[PDB]
Ligand binder design. Sequence first.
Ligand code: CLA
Ligand code: CLA
Ligand code: CLA
Ligand code: CLA
Ligand code: CLA
Ligand code: CLA
Ligand code: CLA
Ligand SMILES: CC1=C(/C=C/C(C)=C/C=C/C(C)=C/C=C/C=C(C)/C=C/C=C(C)/C=C/C2=C(C)CCCC2(C)C)C(C)(C)CCC1
Ligand code: SF4
Lengths: 62, 102, 41, 80, 165, 31, 75, 75, 732, 35
Amino acid sequence: QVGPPRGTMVKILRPESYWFNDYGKVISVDQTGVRYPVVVRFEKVNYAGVSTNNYALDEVEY
Amino acid sequence: FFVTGPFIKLGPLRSTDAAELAGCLSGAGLVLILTACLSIYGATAFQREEVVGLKTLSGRTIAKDPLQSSEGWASFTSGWLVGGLSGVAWSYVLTQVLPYYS
Amino acid sequence: MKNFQIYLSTAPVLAAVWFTVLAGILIELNRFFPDALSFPL
Amino acid sequence: SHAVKIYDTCIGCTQCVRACPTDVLEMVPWDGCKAGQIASAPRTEDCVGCKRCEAACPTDFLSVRVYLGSETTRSMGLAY
Amino acid sequence: RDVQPYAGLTPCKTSKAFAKREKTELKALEKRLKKYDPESAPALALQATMEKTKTRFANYGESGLLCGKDGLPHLIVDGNLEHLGEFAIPGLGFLYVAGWIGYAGRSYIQENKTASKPTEGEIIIDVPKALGLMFQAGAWPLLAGLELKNGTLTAPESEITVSPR
Amino acid sequence: MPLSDTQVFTALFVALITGILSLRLGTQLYK
Amino acid sequence: HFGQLGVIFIWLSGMYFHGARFSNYEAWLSDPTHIKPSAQVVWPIVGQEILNGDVGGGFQGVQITSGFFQLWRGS
Amino acid sequence: SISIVIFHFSWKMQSDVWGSVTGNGVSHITGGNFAQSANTINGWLRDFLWAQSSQVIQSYGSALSAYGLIFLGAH
Amino acid sequence: ATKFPKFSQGLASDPTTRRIWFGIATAHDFETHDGMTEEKLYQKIFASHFGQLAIIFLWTSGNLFHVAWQGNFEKWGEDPLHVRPIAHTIWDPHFGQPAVEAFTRGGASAPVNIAYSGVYQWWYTIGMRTNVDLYNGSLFLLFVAGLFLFAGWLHLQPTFAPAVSWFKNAESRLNHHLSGLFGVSSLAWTGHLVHVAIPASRGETVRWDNFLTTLPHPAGLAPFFTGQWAVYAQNPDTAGHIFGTSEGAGTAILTFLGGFHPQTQSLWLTDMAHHHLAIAVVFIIAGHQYRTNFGIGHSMKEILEAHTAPSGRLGAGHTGLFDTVNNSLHFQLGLALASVGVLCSLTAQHMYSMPPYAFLAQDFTTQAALYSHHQYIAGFIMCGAFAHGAIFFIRDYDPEANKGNVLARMLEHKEAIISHLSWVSLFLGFHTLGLYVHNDVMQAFGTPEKQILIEPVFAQWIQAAQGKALYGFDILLSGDNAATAAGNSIYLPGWLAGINSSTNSLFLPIGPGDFLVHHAIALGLHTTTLILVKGALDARGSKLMPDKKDFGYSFPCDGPGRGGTCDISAWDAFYLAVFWELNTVSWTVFYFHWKHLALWQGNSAQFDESSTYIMGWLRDYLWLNSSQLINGYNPFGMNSLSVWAWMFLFGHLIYATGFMFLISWRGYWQELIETLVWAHERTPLANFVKWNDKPVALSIVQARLVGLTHFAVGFVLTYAAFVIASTSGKFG
Amino acid sequence: MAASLLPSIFVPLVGLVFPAVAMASLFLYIEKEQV
Ligand code: CLA
Ligand code: CLA
Ligand code: CLA
Ligand code: CLA
Ligand code: CLA
Ligand code: CLA
Ligand code: CLA
Ligand SMILES: CC1=C(/C=C/C(C)=C/C=C/C(C)=C/C=C/C=C(C)/C=C/C=C(C)/C=C/C2=C(C)CCCC2(C)C)C(C)(C)CCC1
Ligand code: SF4
């Protein structure tokens, strides 16, 4: 297992992200070596209305 | 022939005795403008191949209209110019000649 | 009953009550202390 | 015609493809995402630019982007 | 009170144009009155309006107002001691009240942010807690000073979402 | 004193030359 | 639709009630040609009492243009 | 469209119908200027909008001061 | 494909009418042209600058020629106060006999237009007296325009075409423009004023014929080179001096009297000559600052590089900005536009209050027209400056190179700037509108004494500092201290005479209406700046659209997704800010025009009474002064203001037509055009004629622009018609 | 003589003749096929 454990709050570092500099719960991290394995869930919705998306290991901080 | 009439009866000089001459010169000027419009349309419009043919509603294959070509539209424009000037002159003649014109 | 109270606690009803009361107090102050261009001293 | 680009943040949810009204987008096999598929835009000439794909893309920021460019007949969506 | 002339403005109490304003309005009132017989209610209402105009003009005379060439009072807001009631004291009252409103709002939004479903409580206001925070916001300037000194008034730069630029 | 006709026509001919030069500049720009 | 009709009936009740306790309909009846109809009187609070115009009949109020006085006279 | 219908109605009635007979012919509100001025946009701007606005813009200090305030507010 | 988008293949292959529109629109956007190198970009820009300079000079020569040929310049010079200037003869075939008989003003024998541009006063002040002088000037400027057209043609040839590095030579360009384009030009103008304009003002005509024989001063250049420069100020013009005559005419050519010439109510020509001389000296000195070819002077790159705040509050300082400015044509264009717009505002604000032209203050319509002209030009130029800065941020800004400098810092705290602009705009608008509505209500309720009339004591205190003795602060020039004592040797008597006079507009008296309108102006400037700075800083991306820099400066939207992104581009921010710019400039010029109309009727009390509430502006200014304008033509004939009435209604028409393009949007119109295409295709005798380009609705950006253009055109034409017609109907 | 002649010639020249030729010419160029 790599990346943040499930349930932890991670600070988003992707500049273009709607939740940039915001904190979101980690739902799951894909261990099959995908490009964006970190699934982060967000209390607040973006302009598209979604509350989650995928991030890489260097696009999150905990 | 017809386009002269509005200038005769509603132009600036409609009240004056020279109403007819003014209206006919206005009609001739408009004929010249429309000749210019026709010449430029003929120069620009027919530049494409138009590979698709034409048929009648009965299904008979027919040749394209020679009018629908650059040189054909040029000949049509020349006919327009001659006809328009002759018609304007005829309208002048009839306004000066016709018994019940007023 | 209680749900109706909750309904009253909704944003529109509460805004209407709060601004009704506020307009009332401001009108009463302008009735009892009318025509106040500046704070007197 | 317009330009449609697919970025590696795509999760292969197919919503861009299903939203396209001119069949510009298609799903292709891809190892990068969990779902195992990325979108592509082969028939870019047919892109009218309606940006339904961008509206239907869940990923933040969008994995499909449409950049309006040279306007052709098909891009202008003209029946004449 | 008697105020010194300032910025080429004479006091309204000793201003002839202020007296003309009063006179004109009162005469208009009389004209309006004349058509009504004194026994009828509009006559008494108009007489009360005339009284109100007289006492307003008198109060504006005594309140140390400076009038202009036009004849209407003019406010001095540069901070002058003789005209502090024009802007400073009502300005202080507004700053106190507006800061109370804002601090009650900030306190409620921060308290509701800890609820299980903050957005539902955003539209259905918890009236008891709301009123508790509203009355606690009486000491807004103090509590704001505490927040400023402790650094919790302002969120740090890193926590705030920003554009990618 | 009104301008003489020779003055008006000389200035107008200078304008015509200026207009020719403007056309030369426009053609050169269009290249 | 029932609720809308209840609202309309509230509005009519208001108009008739104002035409009864806040109007000069009885004065206007004797002199309809010279008395201006009026069925709204404002409270004298912030100098808005000036809106109570000289509509006639020993009365002051906002002159009305709904024609309600004419309707009542015709009724 | 309604803005034009009601403007036509108001001007035509003030000019050619409404008025007061005094035994020496009709004295219309605007004096019958519609027939000779309502054929030009300038005529509507001047003899209807500009001319008839004097009542609403000079309404301050009277009972129609509310109408003047609403005029500005609606603008 | 077609040949008209010669610079755009992508538009050449476009099969619709959008091709024609966008080839017109993107013609001057050289940077986005196919196969466009930087060298071709710079050469074409250089030759276009040559071209429109020649256009400027042909416009000036045309004005001179028309005034010389069809004008009444001599007669106007004889009686400047009782002769209306003539602009040009009218030959309109559509005129009726009343129009021909009503437009014949001045001493013309033909219908004419009354020159409201002030060119008569300007040309009279500079020494031109006769139609021959104006004709000679027009011919000379015709030759100059031909010379510049030939120069553009020549520097477009490959031998004479300069490389990019010639344009990038900043130091040499600024040295030569400061010393020569500014400094030497000012010196030459001084030589003109001393040799020609001042002697012509004192009666003696000094043309090229008698040039080189009449000394401009009774002493020669002996006082100059012997250092006795005070001889040139020995005997100024007398107060009782009549312009253009020798009565009370002095001999001093250069001086600093200050104030205004009493008979013309304009600046003393000796003052303005001494002024241009001092500018010439300062700018010739200034143009030796930078290092070009001689081992001395500054290097601008290193100037910027060494100015970094030691504490790091500014970040890396200005490090990297030299290349940013020099390589970015849009940065340079935004700076030049910003400065030019500020200057145009300064000219508007200084020509009304300090008229530099003889008999300009007495001609009120020209003053109003010039103020409105320069303020509207300034507002548009400002909008352009900010738009081009947004364009710089998109096309020309390099975040990697500008890392850490003030510009990247602007990107970093842009949200704070935009939010505080929003705060100041909201505060100003809430309180200004509230005070205006309060005053409206109090006037409405018959109690105008209860209005919140804030006395603008700060501006009045400045005026008191500057010599005005109305308010009684008496601090700096109105009081008796060191500053006034130092001033009272040369300039201050004339300045105090000018500023304390009720006739001129040097520093007008200020009231609560002036307070409220200046705060309205502040609202307008703060809001327009909000919109424009928001457009510039969010040009490269925002939270709604992070990758906005990849879509160029002007794009319609990013679709209805993500809630909707209409008017999201920086171009759209400009488009929105032009409305606020027009609104603000209209507020300023409405204030100017009403205050000056009250001054010119002699009753300033009208403005001071009715400017505190909006109904007073609507009634006593707009409705009141529109009476004679709308009566330009009527069923009882017409008068000389019928053209301005027609233009007034014309501008109303354009404004409304603009509203059509602004409110209704593309997709209704596209379907309507589709039905029209079907109709034309299926109409007998009309299907013989077929369009070459497929007819389509205007694109979103195109139509936004078209509507904005109509809005602005109708705005400007309506107000121009109003400000000219009312002022000419009341004052000529 | 210039004053009595040149306006009556140049106003139609610039407001009817030059516009006609310019619009016609520009039309012919814009609609001119690339090849
Ligand atoms: C840009 C300057 C300018 C302007 C705005 C005008 C405006 C006018 N002129 Mg004047 N004129 C000018 C320069 C100008 N002129 C110059 C330099 C000359 C040469 C000395 C003349 C000589 C002249 C004569 C002799 C007459 C006019 C007439 C007229 C009137 C309309 C008829 C017309 O256009 O014929 C203009 C005639 C021409 C031969 C063209 C001259 C224009 C100049 C030289 C070129 C300007 C081009 C411009 C900068 C760029 C155009 C491109 C694009 C923006 C459209 C009108 C008031 C007539 C008039 O008074 O009618 C009542 C008339 O009889 N003009
Ligand atoms: C009849 C009187 C009257 C009325 C109706 C208003 C109405 C209004 N004012 Mg104004 N104001 C008035 C008199 C009045 N004002 C006077 C006399 C002053 C001088 C003190 C001010 C100074 C003032 C300022 C400085 C501001 C307002 C703002 C506002 C708006 C929101 C105020 C509020 O409480 O929101 C509820 C309150 C909050 C949400 C809390 C926000 C912060 C508040 C406004 C101030 C507290 C900060 C603190 C004291 C530091 C102040 C710094 C300042 C000096 C720069 C509202 C439209 C605000 C506005 O619209 O600007 C965008 C604003 O910033 N007013
Ligand atoms: C919790 C209340 C609250 C507080 C403390 C603030 C504070 C601030 N706002 Mg915000 N704002 C609020 C509510 C609040 N706002 C609401 C409800 C709106 C929607 C209308 C806005 C809309 C808004 C805009 C559009 C802007 C601000 C700006 C600002 C700043 C300038 C001062 C100011 O308030 O003037 C602005 C004041 C107003 C717009 C008046 C609205 C405030 C109302 C009266 C508060 C309503 C809530 C109330 C307290 C009840 C809830 C609690 C209760 C249940 C107990 C400041 C940071 C400006 C900024 O960014 O400055 C840097 C700016 O441009 N605000
Ligand atoms: C002495 C040397 C000299 C001089 C006179 C000029 C002059 C000029 N250059 Mg420069 N240039 C020089 C050297 C010089 N250059 C050198 C060495 C280089 C190489 C680096 C360049 C490179 C260069 C480029 C690359 C360009 C120019 C351009 C221009 C022209 C700009 C237009 C202009 O003057 O606006 C008018 C401006 C003024 C007269 C000064 C402005 C003062 C302020 C804004 C106004 C004050 C006005 C005043 C109050 C009076 C107004 C009212 C009155 C009319 C009533 C101008 C004629 C541009 C061009 O192409 O034009 C052909 C251009 O693009 N130059
Ligand atoms: C010295 C000044 C200067 C310079 C060199 C430029 C140069 C440029 N600008 Mg900038 N700009 C300026 C001033 C300037 N502008 C000003 C003052 C404004 C504010 C109005 C703008 C606003 C602006 C925008 C918003 C944009 C540009 C763009 C551009 C570029 C392309 C222009 C274009 O699209 O083709 C030429 C433009 C046209 C042919 C359109 C003109 C249409 C006008 C408005 C019609 C007016 C109608 C007329 C007056 C009515 C007649 C009277 C009536 C009675 C009939 C080019 C780099 C565009 C670009 O892509 O930048 C890179 C762009 O998006 N500029
Ligand atoms: C008269 C017309 C008008 C008015 C009032 C406004 C007002 C505003 N615009 Mg808009 N705008 C307009 C026309 C107008 N605009 C047009 C035609 C354009 C061109 C598209 C724009 C383009 C535009 C842009 C692009 C921007 C603005 C911004 C602003 C704000 C500037 C700040 C300010 O002045 O705050 C003071 C606010 C006002 C005067 C608004 C009205 C507030 C009223 C007085 C309070 C009402 C209270 C009362 C109880 C209401 C009763 C209602 C009841 C029935 C509920 C403000 C909200 C800027 C902004 O958002 O800055 C923060 C901004 O970015 N506007
Ligand atoms: C339908 C009515 C109508 C028409 C056709 C005209 C026509 C004319 N008037 Mg008259 N006028 C009218 C009504 C009309 N007027 C009315 C009601 C009044 C009020 C009483 C006047 C008052 C009046 C005055 C006071 C004057 C005129 C003048 C003129 C002439 C302008 C000279 C010219 O052609 O310049 C050339 C045309 C222009 C400069 C216009 C440019 C506008 C365009 C759209 C700008 C944008 C151009 C853009 C680049 C596209 C160009 C395309 C191009 C290639 C075709 C012209 C003969 C003037 C005159 O005779 O002077 C010589 C003059 O001084 N008129
Ligand atoms: C967007 C952008 C841009 C543009 C911008 C702009 C447009 C700005 C503007 C700005 C402006 C427009 C500014 C202005 C300013 C001003 C000033 C800064 C002034 C000053 C003054 C002073 C300092 C004075 C002093 C004095 C006085 C008080 C009086 C008397 C005299 C004396 C001198 C003493 C750019 C390109 C850059 C960049 C990119 C982005
Ligand atoms: S682009 Fe957006 S929508 Fe289309 S597949 Fe990739 S993720 Fe799902």
